[PDB]
Design a protein around this ligand. Structure first.
Ligand SMILES: Nc1ncnc2c1ncn2[C@@H]1O[C@H](C[C@@H](N)CC[C@H](N)C(=O)O)[C@@H](O)[C@H]1O
Ligand SMILES: Nc1ncnc2c1ncn2[C@@H]1O[C@H](C[C@@H](N)CC[C@H](N)C(=O)O)[C@@H](O)[C@H]1O
Lengths: 239, 249
RNA sequence: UGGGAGGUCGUCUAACGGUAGGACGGCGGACUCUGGAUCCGCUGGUGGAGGUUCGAGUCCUCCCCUCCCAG
Protein backbone atom coordinates (compact mmCIF):
# COMPACT_ATOMS: atom_id res chain seq x y z
CA UNK A 1 0.00 0.00 0.00
CA UNK A 2 0.93 3.70 0.43
CA UNK A 3 1.81 6.18 3.21
CA UNK A 4 1.55 9.97 2.79
CA UNK A 5 2.87 12.66 5.07
CA UNK A 6 1.49 16.16 4.70
CA UNK A 7 2.85 19.37 6.23
CA UNK A 8 0.03 21.91 6.22
CA UNK A 9 -1.39 24.75 8.28
CA UNK A 10 -4.90 23.37 7.73
CA UNK A 11 -4.65 19.61 8.22
CA UNK A 12 -8.43 19.31 8.63
CA UNK A 13 -8.82 20.26 4.98
CA UNK A 14 -7.40 16.82 4.30
CA UNK A 15 -10.52 15.21 5.73
CA UNK A 16 -11.93 16.13 2.29
CA UNK A 17 -10.09 13.11 0.90
CA UNK A 18 -9.66 10.95 4.01
CA UNK A 19 -13.37 10.64 4.66
CA UNK A 20 -15.18 10.48 1.32
CA UNK A 21 -15.33 8.46 -1.84
CA UNK A 22 -12.69 6.09 -3.12
CA UNK A 23 -9.95 7.65 -1.04
CA UNK A 24 -12.08 7.60 2.11
CA UNK A 25 -12.68 3.87 1.63
CA UNK A 26 -8.97 3.35 0.91
CA UNK A 27 -8.23 4.99 4.26
CA UNK A 28 -10.78 2.82 6.04
CA UNK A 29 -9.24 -0.36 4.66
CA UNK A 30 -5.74 0.69 5.71
CA UNK A 31 -4.68 0.65 2.08
CA UNK A 32 -3.84 4.32 2.34
CA UNK A 33 -2.54 6.11 5.40
CA UNK A 34 -2.37 9.92 5.56
CA UNK A 35 -0.69 11.73 8.44
CA UNK A 36 -0.56 15.49 8.85
CA UNK A 37 1.81 17.75 10.72
CA UNK A 38 1.05 21.42 11.32
CA UNK A 39 3.96 23.92 11.52
CA UNK A 40 1.91 25.81 14.16
CA UNK A 41 2.53 22.98 16.60
CA UNK A 42 6.20 23.74 16.16
CA UNK A 43 6.03 27.38 17.25
CA UNK A 44 7.40 28.44 20.62
CA UNK A 45 5.47 31.63 21.23
CA UNK A 46 2.01 32.63 22.49
CA UNK A 47 0.70 33.64 19.04
CA UNK A 48 2.14 30.55 17.34
CA UNK A 49 3.88 32.56 14.63
CA UNK A 50 4.56 30.59 11.43
CA UNK A 51 5.11 33.52 9.09
CA UNK A 52 6.31 37.04 8.66
CA UNK A 53 6.88 39.77 6.14
CA UNK A 54 9.24 39.22 3.23
CA UNK A 55 12.45 41.28 3.40
CA UNK A 56 12.72 44.28 1.18
CA UNK A 57 9.20 45.15 2.24
CA UNK A 58 6.19 45.36 -0.02
CA UNK A 59 2.92 43.52 0.69
CA UNK A 60 2.36 39.84 1.63
CA UNK A 61 3.44 37.20 4.17
CA UNK A 62 6.00 34.36 3.71
CA UNK A 63 6.08 31.26 5.77
CA UNK A 64 8.92 31.05 8.27
CA UNK A 65 11.57 28.41 7.79
CA UNK A 66 11.87 26.91 11.29
CA UNK A 67 8.34 25.60 11.97
CA UNK A 68 8.28 24.02 8.51
CA UNK A 69 11.79 22.59 8.88
CA UNK A 70 11.00 21.15 12.26
CA UNK A 71 7.72 19.77 11.02
CA UNK A 72 9.45 18.19 8.01
CA UNK A 73 12.15 16.58 10.17
CA UNK A 74 9.47 15.25 12.46
CA UNK A 75 7.61 13.76 9.51
CA UNK A 76 10.82 12.39 7.95
CA UNK A 77 11.63 10.85 11.29
CA UNK A 78 8.23 9.21 11.85
CA UNK A 79 8.35 8.22 8.13
CA UNK A 80 11.32 5.87 8.09
CA UNK A 81 13.93 5.08 5.46
CA UNK A 82 13.83 7.15 2.29
CA UNK A 83 10.85 9.47 2.39
CA UNK A 84 10.90 11.83 -0.60
CA UNK A 85 9.92 15.43 0.13
CA UNK A 86 7.85 17.30 -2.47
CA UNK A 87 6.87 20.93 -2.39
CA UNK A 88 3.67 21.90 -4.16
CA UNK A 89 4.36 24.93 -6.29
CA UNK A 90 3.41 26.53 -9.60
CA UNK A 91 7.12 26.79 -10.41
CA UNK A 92 7.50 23.03 -10.22
CA UNK A 93 7.13 20.33 -12.86
CA UNK A 94 3.66 20.47 -14.40
CA UNK A 95 1.82 17.27 -13.32
CA UNK A 96 0.54 14.84 -15.99
CA UNK A 97 -0.33 11.14 -16.10
CA UNK A 98 3.30 10.14 -16.73
CA UNK A 99 4.36 12.08 -13.66
CA UNK A 100 1.56 10.46 -11.72
CA UNK A 101 2.78 6.97 -12.71
CA UNK A 102 6.32 7.95 -11.69
CA UNK A 103 5.12 9.27 -8.33
CA UNK A 104 3.11 6.11 -7.67
CA UNK A 105 6.40 4.21 -7.29
CA UNK A 106 7.51 5.85 -4.06
CA UNK A 107 6.01 3.97 -1.10
CA UNK A 108 6.29 7.05 1.10
CA UNK A 109 6.07 10.75 0.30
CA UNK A 110 5.92 13.95 2.30
CA UNK A 111 3.98 16.86 0.81
CA UNK A 112 4.68 20.47 1.75
CA UNK A 113 1.80 22.96 1.32
CA UNK A 114 2.44 26.71 1.00
CA UNK A 115 0.14 29.63 1.95
CA UNK A 116 0.11 33.42 1.48
CA UNK A 117 2.94 34.52 -0.75
CA UNK A 118 4.78 31.25 -0.34
CA UNK A 119 7.74 29.88 1.60
CA UNK A 120 11.37 30.88 2.32
CA UNK A 121 13.77 30.07 -0.54
CA UNK A 122 16.22 28.54 1.86
CA UNK A 123 13.71 25.94 2.96
CA UNK A 124 13.35 24.89 -0.69
CA UNK A 125 17.10 24.68 -1.07
CA UNK A 126 17.73 22.74 2.13
CA UNK A 127 14.73 20.44 2.54
CA UNK A 128 12.91 19.89 -0.74
CA UNK A 129 13.71 17.10 -3.19
CA UNK A 130 11.18 17.89 -5.98
CA UNK A 131 8.66 20.65 -6.84
CA UNK A 132 5.36 19.83 -8.53
CA UNK A 133 2.71 22.11 -10.05
CA UNK A 134 -0.81 20.93 -10.86
CA UNK A 135 -1.20 23.46 -13.67
CA UNK A 136 -0.34 26.86 -15.05
CA UNK A 137 -2.50 28.84 -12.65
CA UNK A 138 -2.04 30.13 -9.10
CA UNK A 139 -3.92 29.10 -5.92
CA UNK A 140 -4.15 30.57 -2.42
CA UNK A 141 -2.55 27.51 -0.81
CA UNK A 142 -1.00 24.11 -1.39
CA UNK A 143 -3.58 21.91 0.34
CA UNK A 144 -5.79 21.46 -2.71
CA UNK A 145 -2.83 20.71 -4.97
CA UNK A 146 -1.60 18.18 -2.42
CA UNK A 147 -4.97 16.46 -2.23
CA UNK A 148 -5.13 16.38 -6.02
CA UNK A 149 -1.79 14.69 -6.22
CA UNK A 150 -2.71 12.23 -3.50
CA UNK A 151 -5.95 11.32 -5.29
CA UNK A 152 -4.31 10.90 -8.71
CA UNK A 153 -1.62 8.57 -7.37
CA UNK A 154 -4.12 6.71 -5.12
CA UNK A 155 -5.85 5.50 -8.30
CA UNK A 156 -2.89 3.09 -8.46
CA UNK A 157 -2.69 1.58 -4.98
CA UNK A 158 -3.31 -2.13 -5.55
CA UNK A 159 -6.91 -3.12 -4.81
CA UNK A 160 -8.84 0.11 -5.32
CA UNK A 161 -10.27 -0.19 -8.85
CA UNK A 162 -9.61 5.15 -16.72
CA UNK A 163 -9.07 8.18 -19.03
CA UNK A 164 -5.56 8.32 -20.59
CA UNK A 165 -5.45 4.55 -20.12
CA UNK A 166 -3.87 4.36 -23.55
CA UNK A 167 -2.88 8.01 -23.84
CA UNK A 168 -6.28 8.89 -25.27
CA UNK A 169 -9.18 10.90 -23.99
CA UNK A 170 -12.05 8.75 -22.77
CA UNK A 171 -15.04 7.90 -25.03
CA UNK A 172 -18.59 9.21 -24.49
CA UNK A 173 -20.80 7.28 -22.07
CA UNK A 174 -24.51 6.46 -21.84
CA UNK A 175 -26.91 4.91 -19.28
CA UNK A 176 -30.68 4.57 -18.81
CA UNK A 177 -33.04 5.89 -20.15
CA UNK A 178 -32.74 4.82 -23.81
CA UNK A 179 -34.04 8.25 -24.82
CA UNK A 180 -33.16 11.40 -22.93
CA UNK A 181 -34.52 14.78 -24.07
CA UNK A 182 -34.99 13.31 -27.55
CA UNK A 183 -31.43 11.94 -27.61
CA UNK A 184 -31.06 8.24 -28.34
CA UNK A 185 -28.31 5.84 -27.26
CA UNK A 186 -26.04 4.71 -30.15
CA UNK A 187 -27.51 1.52 -31.69
CA UNK A 188 -24.03 -0.03 -31.64
CA UNK A 189 -24.08 -0.04 -27.79
CA UNK A 190 -27.19 -2.19 -28.08
CA UNK A 191 -25.90 -4.88 -30.50
CA UNK A 192 -24.69 -6.93 -27.52
CA UNK A 193 -21.69 -8.04 -29.57
CA UNK A 194 -18.81 -6.94 -27.35
CA UNK A 195 -16.20 -6.70 -30.11
CA UNK A 196 -18.09 -4.35 -32.45
CA UNK A 197 -18.82 -2.19 -29.41
CA UNK A 198 -15.17 -2.10 -28.34
CA UNK A 199 -14.06 -1.00 -31.79
CA UNK A 200 -16.75 1.69 -31.81
CA UNK A 201 -15.61 3.03 -28.41
CA UNK A 202 -11.95 3.03 -29.44
CA UNK A 203 -12.77 4.90 -32.64
CA UNK A 204 -14.62 7.37 -30.52
CA UNK A 205 -11.63 7.88 -28.15
CA UNK A 206 -9.39 8.56 -31.14
CA UNK A 207 -11.88 10.97 -32.70
CA UNK A 208 -12.27 12.82 -29.40
CA UNK A 209 -8.51 13.01 -28.72
CA UNK A 210 -7.86 14.22 -32.24
CA UNK A 211 -10.47 16.96 -32.17
CA UNK A 212 -10.23 18.41 -28.66
CA UNK A 213 -6.56 17.75 -27.86
CA UNK A 214 -4.60 16.88 -31.07
CA UNK A 215 -1.22 17.52 -29.41
CA UNK A 216 -1.78 14.54 -27.12
CA UNK A 217 -1.88 12.59 -30.36
CA UNK A 218 1.63 13.62 -31.41
CA UNK A 219 3.62 11.34 -29.12
CA UNK A 220 1.75 8.05 -29.34
CA UNK A 221 2.71 4.95 -31.33
CA UNK A 222 -0.69 3.71 -32.54
CA UNK A 223 -1.43 0.09 -33.47
CA UNK A 224 -2.46 -0.57 -37.08
CA UNK A 225 -6.03 -0.77 -35.93
CA UNK A 226 -5.94 2.55 -34.09
CA UNK A 227 -4.46 4.33 -37.10
CA UNK A 228 -7.18 2.82 -39.27
CA UNK A 229 -10.01 3.85 -36.97
CA UNK A 230 -8.68 7.37 -36.63
CA UNK A 231 -8.48 7.75 -40.46
CA UNK A 232 -12.05 6.44 -40.78
CA UNK A 233 -13.11 8.95 -38.12
CA UNK A 234 -11.22 11.67 -40.00
CA UNK A 235 -13.16 10.95 -43.18
CA UNK A 236 -16.53 11.72 -41.52
CA UNK A 237 -15.47 15.13 -40.10
CA UNK A 238 -14.34 16.90 -43.27
CA UNK A 239 -17.08 15.47 -45.49
CA UNK B 1 -19.33 45.60 -2.12
CA UNK B 2 -18.09 42.89 -4.54
CA UNK B 3 -19.56 39.37 -4.63
CA UNK B 4 -19.69 36.03 -6.48
CA UNK B 5 -22.07 33.11 -6.43
CA UNK B 6 -21.08 29.51 -7.14
CA UNK B 7 -23.58 26.69 -7.32
CA UNK B 8 -22.11 23.20 -6.99
CA UNK B 9 -23.62 19.77 -7.75
CA UNK B 10 -21.76 17.03 -5.85
CA UNK B 11 -22.43 13.78 -4.02
CA UNK B 12 -20.01 14.89 -1.32
CA UNK B 13 -20.85 18.56 -0.56
CA UNK B 14 -19.04 18.31 2.79
CA UNK B 15 -15.72 18.27 0.96
CA UNK B 16 -16.33 21.91 0.24
CA UNK B 17 -15.80 22.85 3.87
CA UNK B 18 -12.14 22.64 2.86
CA UNK B 19 -12.53 25.91 1.00
CA UNK B 20 -15.48 27.52 2.74
CA UNK B 21 -14.10 27.15 6.26
CA UNK B 22 -10.34 27.69 5.72
CA UNK B 23 -7.91 30.35 4.72
CA UNK B 24 -8.51 33.32 2.50
CA UNK B 25 -11.41 31.65 0.66
CA UNK B 26 -13.08 30.68 3.91
CA UNK B 27 -12.84 34.33 4.99
CA UNK B 28 -14.19 35.41 1.62
CA UNK B 29 -17.21 33.23 2.35
CA UNK B 30 -17.53 34.67 5.88
CA UNK B 31 -17.39 38.19 4.48
CA UNK B 32 -20.07 37.41 1.93
CA UNK B 33 -17.63 38.09 -0.88
CA UNK B 34 -18.05 34.56 -2.12
CA UNK B 35 -21.18 32.40 -1.77
CA UNK B 36 -21.25 28.67 -2.41
CA UNK B 37 -24.38 26.53 -2.44
CA UNK B 38 -24.30 22.76 -2.86
CA UNK B 39 -27.05 20.55 -4.19
CA UNK B 40 -26.62 16.80 -3.69
CA UNK B 41 -28.06 14.37 -6.23
CA UNK B 42 -28.74 11.91 -3.37
CA UNK B 43 -31.38 14.37 -2.10
CA UNK B 44 -33.03 13.94 -5.52
CA UNK B 45 -32.86 10.13 -5.73
CA UNK B 46 -36.26 8.51 -5.69
CA UNK B 47 -34.82 5.04 -5.17
CA UNK B 48 -35.57 3.58 -1.71
CA UNK B 49 -31.86 2.73 -1.32
CA UNK B 50 -30.96 6.19 -2.69
CA UNK B 51 -28.99 4.81 -5.63
CA UNK B 52 -27.02 7.55 -7.39
CA UNK B 53 -25.19 5.46 -10.00
CA UNK B 54 -26.40 3.44 -12.95
CA UNK B 55 -25.08 1.00 -15.55
CA UNK B 56 -23.39 2.13 -18.80
CA UNK B 57 -24.75 0.62 -22.00
CA UNK B 58 -22.17 -1.72 -23.46
CA UNK B 59 -20.82 -3.03 -20.14
CA UNK B 60 -17.22 -2.85 -18.92
CA UNK B 61 -15.36 -0.92 -16.19
CA UNK B 62 -17.24 1.38 -13.89
CA UNK B 63 -20.71 2.69 -13.27
CA UNK B 64 -22.03 5.99 -14.48
CA UNK B 65 -23.98 8.49 -12.51
CA UNK B 66 -27.70 7.84 -12.73
CA UNK B 67 -29.40 10.42 -14.97
CA UNK B 68 -32.49 11.44 -12.98
CA UNK B 69 -30.97 12.50 -9.65
CA UNK B 70 -28.16 14.36 -11.34
CA UNK B 71 -30.37 15.97 -14.00
CA UNK B 72 -32.81 17.10 -11.34
CA UNK B 73 -30.11 18.59 -9.09
CA UNK B 74 -28.82 20.51 -12.11
CA UNK B 75 -32.32 21.80 -12.93
CA UNK B 76 -32.74 22.93 -9.37
CA UNK B 77 -29.46 24.80 -9.39
CA UNK B 78 -30.15 26.42 -12.74
CA UNK B 79 -33.51 27.41 -11.32
CA UNK B 80 -32.04 29.01 -8.20
CA UNK B 81 -29.43 30.87 -10.22
CA UNK B 82 -31.75 32.49 -12.77
CA UNK B 83 -30.18 34.11 -15.84
CA UNK B 84 -26.46 34.59 -16.40
CA UNK B 85 -25.72 31.25 -14.81
CA UNK B 86 -23.08 29.51 -16.94
CA UNK B 87 -22.86 25.73 -16.35
CA UNK B 88 -19.45 24.05 -16.35
CA UNK B 89 -18.66 20.39 -16.27
CA UNK B 90 -15.34 19.49 -14.74
CA UNK B 91 -13.85 16.78 -16.97
CA UNK B 92 -10.40 15.79 -18.27
CA UNK B 93 -11.83 16.04 -21.79
CA UNK B 94 -12.43 19.76 -21.30
CA UNK B 95 -10.39 22.88 -21.97
CA UNK B 96 -7.14 22.75 -20.01
CA UNK B 97 -7.19 25.45 -17.35
CA UNK B 98 -4.45 28.11 -17.37
CA UNK B 99 -4.15 31.60 -15.91
CA UNK B 100 -5.72 33.17 -19.01
CA UNK B 101 -8.66 30.83 -18.76
CA UNK B 102 -8.93 31.68 -15.07
CA UNK B 103 -9.12 35.40 -15.91
CA UNK B 104 -11.86 34.50 -18.43
CA UNK B 105 -13.92 32.47 -15.94
CA UNK B 106 -13.51 35.21 -13.37
CA UNK B 107 -15.56 37.41 -15.68
CA UNK B 108 -18.71 35.49 -14.68
CA UNK B 109 -20.85 36.63 -11.71
CA UNK B 110 -22.55 33.23 -11.44
CA UNK B 111 -21.34 29.71 -12.18
CA UNK B 112 -22.73 26.25 -11.62
CA UNK B 113 -20.11 23.51 -11.31
CA UNK B 114 -21.00 19.89 -12.00
CA UNK B 115 -18.67 17.38 -10.28
CA UNK B 116 -18.61 13.89 -11.77
CA UNK B 117 -18.04 10.58 -10.00
CA UNK B 118 -17.52 6.97 -11.09
CA UNK B 119 -16.89 6.90 -14.85
CA UNK B 120 -18.52 10.27 -15.45
CA UNK B 121 -21.92 11.41 -16.64
CA UNK B 122 -24.24 10.57 -19.53
CA UNK B 123 -23.11 12.34 -22.70
CA UNK B 124 -26.63 13.61 -23.38
CA UNK B 125 -26.72 15.55 -20.12
CA UNK B 126 -23.50 17.19 -21.26
CA UNK B 127 -25.00 18.16 -24.58
CA UNK B 128 -28.29 19.40 -23.15
CA UNK B 129 -27.32 20.94 -19.81
CA UNK B 130 -23.62 21.82 -19.91
CA UNK B 131 -22.38 25.12 -21.29
CA UNK B 132 -18.57 24.49 -21.09
CA UNK B 133 -16.21 21.64 -20.16
CA UNK B 134 -13.01 22.36 -18.17
CA UNK B 135 -10.00 20.23 -17.08
CA UNK B 136 -7.55 21.24 -14.36
CA UNK B 137 -4.82 19.15 -15.96
CA UNK B 138 -3.94 16.10 -18.03
CA UNK B 139 -4.33 13.54 -15.26
CA UNK B 140 -7.24 11.52 -13.85
CA UNK B 141 -8.90 12.01 -10.46
CA UNK B 142 -11.65 10.07 -8.66
CA UNK B 143 -14.10 12.98 -8.77
CA UNK B 144 -14.81 16.51 -9.91
CA UNK B 145 -14.87 17.97 -6.38
CA UNK B 146 -11.14 18.68 -6.12
CA UNK B 147 -11.16 20.07 -9.64
CA UNK B 148 -14.14 22.20 -8.68
CA UNK B 149 -12.52 23.55 -5.55
CA UNK B 150 -9.37 24.29 -7.54
CA UNK B 151 -11.26 26.26 -10.10
CA UNK B 152 -13.12 28.18 -7.40
CA UNK B 153 -9.86 28.98 -5.50
CA UNK B 154 -7.99 30.07 -8.63
CA UNK B 155 -10.84 32.43 -9.58
CA UNK B 156 -11.37 33.56 -5.99
CA UNK B 157 -7.95 35.16 -6.01
CA UNK B 158 -9.30 37.67 -8.51
CA UNK B 159 -12.27 38.90 -6.50
CA UNK B 160 -11.41 42.34 -4.98
CA UNK B 161 -11.00 42.14 -1.21
CA UNK B 162 -10.38 38.39 -1.16
CA UNK B 163 -6.62 38.85 -0.68
CA UNK B 164 -7.00 42.20 1.08
CA UNK B 165 -3.93 43.56 -0.64
CA UNK B 166 -4.61 43.88 -4.36
CA UNK B 167 -0.88 44.04 -5.13
CA UNK B 168 -0.51 40.49 -3.78
CA UNK B 169 -2.62 39.32 -6.73
CA UNK B 170 0.12 40.47 -9.13
CA UNK B 171 3.02 39.22 -6.97
CA UNK B 172 2.37 35.60 -7.98
CA UNK B 173 3.31 33.46 -10.95
CA UNK B 174 1.47 33.90 -14.25
CA UNK B 175 -0.09 37.09 -12.87
CA UNK B 176 1.95 39.12 -15.37
CA UNK B 177 2.81 36.01 -17.38
CA UNK B 178 6.13 35.47 -15.58
CA UNK B 179 7.06 33.09 -12.79
CA UNK B 180 7.46 34.70 -9.35
CA UNK B 181 10.93 35.61 -8.00
CA UNK B 182 12.30 33.75 -4.92
CA UNK B 183 11.28 35.09 -1.47
CA UNK B 184 12.93 35.38 1.93
CA UNK B 185 11.77 36.27 5.46
CA UNK B 186 13.18 36.29 9.03
CA UNK B 187 15.71 35.46 10.44
CA UNK B 188 18.60 36.96 8.34
CA UNK B 189 20.87 33.92 8.70
CA UNK B 190 19.53 30.42 9.03
CA UNK B 191 21.75 27.26 8.86
CA UNK B 192 24.44 28.98 6.75
CA UNK B 193 22.21 30.40 4.03
CA UNK B 194 22.20 34.24 4.11
CA UNK B 195 19.48 36.49 2.71
CA UNK B 196 20.67 38.22 -0.48
CA UNK B 197 22.00 41.62 0.70
CA UNK B 198 19.99 43.71 -1.74
CA UNK B 199 16.77 42.78 0.12
CA UNK B 200 18.24 44.08 3.37
CA UNK B 201 19.62 47.27 1.90
CA UNK B 202 16.49 49.32 2.35
CA UNK B 203 17.35 50.52 -1.13
CA UNK B 204 13.91 50.42 -2.77
CA UNK B 205 14.91 50.87 -6.36
CA UNK B 206 17.57 48.15 -6.24
CA UNK B 207 15.07 45.88 -4.58
CA UNK B 208 12.42 46.47 -7.25
CA UNK B 209 14.92 45.79 -10.04
CA UNK B 210 16.36 42.72 -8.31
CA UNK B 211 12.90 41.22 -7.85
CA UNK B 212 12.03 41.90 -11.46
CA UNK B 213 15.33 40.55 -12.86
CA UNK B 214 14.89 37.42 -10.74
CA UNK B 215 11.37 36.90 -11.96
CA UNK B 216 12.75 37.08 -15.52
CA UNK B 217 15.69 34.79 -14.84
CA UNK B 218 13.45 32.16 -13.26
CA UNK B 219 10.97 32.30 -16.12
CA UNK B 220 13.67 31.96 -18.74
CA UNK B 221 15.29 28.99 -16.98
CA UNK B 222 12.23 27.00 -16.03
CA UNK B 223 9.51 28.03 -18.47
CA UNK B 224 11.16 29.89 -21.41
CA UNK B 225 8.07 29.30 -23.57
CA UNK B 226 6.14 31.82 -21.47
CA UNK B 227 8.70 34.38 -22.61
CA UNK B 228 7.92 33.63 -26.22
CA UNK B 229 5.58 36.32 -27.55
CA UNK B 230 5.66 38.30 -24.30
CA UNK B 231 5.63 42.11 -24.46
CA UNK B 232 8.36 43.34 -22.15
CA UNK B 233 9.59 46.88 -21.51
CA UNK B 234 13.00 48.31 -22.26
CA UNK B 235 14.01 47.82 -18.62
CA UNK B 236 12.80 44.21 -18.56
CA UNK B 237 14.63 43.49 -21.79
CA UNK B 238 17.82 44.92 -20.30
CA UNK B 239 17.48 42.90 -17.10
CA UNK B 240 16.73 39.72 -18.95
CA UNK B 241 19.75 40.13 -21.24
CA UNK B 242 21.90 40.71 -18.13
CA UNK B 243 20.41 37.59 -16.53
CA UNK B 244 21.05 35.41 -19.61
CA UNK B 245 24.61 36.66 -19.69
CA UNK B 246 25.35 36.35 -15.94
CA UNK B 247 23.79 32.88 -15.72
CA UNK B 248 26.21 31.49 -18.29
CA UNK B 249 29.45 32.90 -16.84
C1' U C 1 42.31 59.32 -14.99
C1' G C 2 39.29 66.10 -19.68
C1' G C 3 34.30 69.59 -19.44
C1' G C 4 29.56 70.26 -16.76
C1' A C 5 26.24 68.87 -12.18
C1' G C 6 25.93 67.23 -7.17
C1' G C 7 26.94 65.20 -1.85
C1' U C 8 21.19 64.92 4.48
C1' C C 9 19.49 58.30 8.36
C1' G C 10 20.21 52.13 4.35
C1' U C 11 16.76 54.18 0.37
C1' C C 12 13.11 58.53 -0.87
C1' U C 13 12.07 63.25 0.57
C1' A C 14 11.76 68.00 3.79
C1' A C 15 14.45 72.15 7.09
C1' C C 16 15.21 81.15 6.91
C1' G C 17 22.34 81.04 8.42
C1' G C 18 18.63 79.33 14.58
C1' U C 19 18.38 72.66 17.98
C1' A C 20 18.02 68.41 11.43
C1' G C 21 11.59 65.88 10.77
C1' G C 22 8.66 62.24 7.50
C1' A C 23 7.75 58.13 4.69
C1' C C 24 9.84 53.19 3.54
C1' G C 25 13.42 49.81 5.71
C1' G C 26 15.67 47.05 9.67
C1' C C 27 15.34 45.42 14.91
C1' G C 28 12.32 44.85 19.39
C1' G C 29 7.67 43.74 21.54
C1' A C 30 2.19 42.67 21.62
C1' C C 31 -1.68 40.86 18.74
C1' U C 32 -8.34 34.90 21.97
C1' C C 33 -9.86 36.45 12.97
C1' U C 34 -3.38 32.75 10.49
C1' G C 35 -5.17 37.69 9.16
C1' G C 36 -1.34 37.86 1.32
C1' A C 37 -2.14 40.84 8.90
C1' U C 38 -2.95 44.76 12.57
C1' C C 39 -1.10 47.77 16.65
C1' C C 40 2.86 49.94 19.69
C1' G C 41 8.12 51.19 20.41
C1' C C 42 13.39 51.38 19.29
C1' U C 43 17.33 52.15 15.67
C1' G C 44 19.43 55.83 12.40
C1' G C 45 21.88 61.14 8.75
C1' U C 46 24.18 66.43 6.93
C1' G C 47 31.48 63.09 3.24
C1' G C 48 36.24 65.55 5.62
C1' A C 49 39.11 69.46 7.46
C1' G C 50 39.65 74.94 7.19
C1' G C 51 37.32 80.37 7.09
C1' U C 52 33.32 83.93 7.64
C1' U C 53 29.42 84.45 11.52
C1' C C 54 27.01 85.44 18.23
C1' G C 55 25.71 80.87 15.41
C1' A C 56 26.83 76.83 9.02
C1' G C 57 23.04 71.06 6.49
C1' U C 58 22.94 75.94 4.20
C1' C C 59 27.81 81.09 2.41
C1' C C 60 33.55 80.77 1.04
C1' U C 61 38.38 77.62 0.28
C1' C C 62 40.72 73.06 -0.18
C1' C C 63 40.36 67.76 0.01
C1' C C 64 37.41 63.41 -0.71
C1' C C 65 33.36 60.93 -3.14
C1' U C 66 29.29 60.49 -6.89
C1' C C 67 26.27 61.37 -11.80
C1' C C 68 26.10 63.35 -16.78
C1' C C 69 29.05 64.82 -21.64
C1' A C 70 34.77 60.55 -26.24
C1' G C 71 38.89 57.91 -23.00
N1 LIG D 1 -0.17 25.75 -9.53
C1 LIG D 1 0.11 25.30 -8.31
N2 LIG D 1 0.52 24.03 -8.14
C2 LIG D 1 0.83 23.58 -6.94
N3 LIG D 1 0.76 24.34 -5.86
C3 LIG D 1 0.35 25.61 -5.95
C4 LIG D 1 0.01 26.12 -7.20
N4 LIG D 1 -0.35 27.39 -7.02
C5 LIG D 1 -0.24 27.67 -5.72
N5 LIG D 1 0.18 26.59 -5.07
C6 LIG D 1 0.38 26.49 -3.60
O1 LIG D 1 -0.21 27.68 -3.05
C7 LIG D 1 0.75 28.29 -2.18
C8 LIG D 1 0.51 29.79 -1.99
C9 LIG D 1 0.81 30.52 -3.30
N6 LIG D 1 -0.03 31.73 -3.40
C10 LIG D 1 2.29 30.91 -3.34
C11 LIG D 1 2.73 31.23 -4.77
C12 LIG D 1 4.19 31.66 -4.83
N7 LIG D 1 4.30 33.10 -4.57
C13 LIG D 1 4.72 31.37 -6.24
O2 LIG D 1 4.49 32.23 -7.12
O3 LIG D 1 5.33 30.29 -6.39
C14 LIG D 1 2.08 28.00 -2.87
O4 LIG D 1 3.12 28.13 -1.90
C15 LIG D 1 1.86 26.52 -3.19
O5 LIG D 1 2.06 25.75 -2.01
N1 LIG E 1 -8.49 16.35 -14.90
C1 LIG E 1 -9.75 16.56 -14.53
N2 LIG E 1 -10.33 17.75 -14.76
C2 LIG E 1 -11.58 17.97 -14.41
N3 LIG E 1 -12.32 17.04 -13.83
C3 LIG E 1 -11.81 15.83 -13.57
C4 LIG E 1 -10.50 15.56 -13.92
N4 LIG E 1 -10.25 14.30 -13.56
C5 LIG E 1 -11.35 13.81 -13.01
N5 LIG E 1 -12.31 14.73 -13.01
C6 LIG E 1 -13.68 14.59 -12.47
O1 LIG E 1 -13.89 13.25 -11.95
C7 LIG E 1 -15.01 12.71 -12.66
C8 LIG E 1 -15.06 11.18 -12.64
C9 LIG E 1 -13.71 10.59 -13.03
N6 LIG E 1 -13.31 9.63 -11.99
C10 LIG E 1 -13.77 9.88 -14.38
C11 LIG E 1 -14.14 10.83 -15.53
C12 LIG E 1 -14.15 10.10 -16.87
N7 LIG E 1 -12.79 9.65 -17.20
C13 LIG E 1 -14.67 11.03 -17.97
O2 LIG E 1 -14.53 10.64 -19.15
O3 LIG E 1 -15.22 12.10 -17.62
C14 LIG E 1 -14.82 13.30 -14.06
O4 LIG E 1 -16.02 13.13 -14.82
C15 LIG E 1 -14.70 14.75 -13.60
O5 LIG E 1 -15.94 15.20 -13.05
Amino acid sequence: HMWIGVISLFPEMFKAITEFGVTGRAVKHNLLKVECWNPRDFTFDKHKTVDDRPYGGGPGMLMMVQPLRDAIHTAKAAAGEGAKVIYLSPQGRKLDQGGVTELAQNQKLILVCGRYEGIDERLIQTEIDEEWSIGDYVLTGGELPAMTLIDAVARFIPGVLDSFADGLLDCPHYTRPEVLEGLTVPPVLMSGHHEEIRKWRLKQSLQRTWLRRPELLEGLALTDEQRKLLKEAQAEHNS
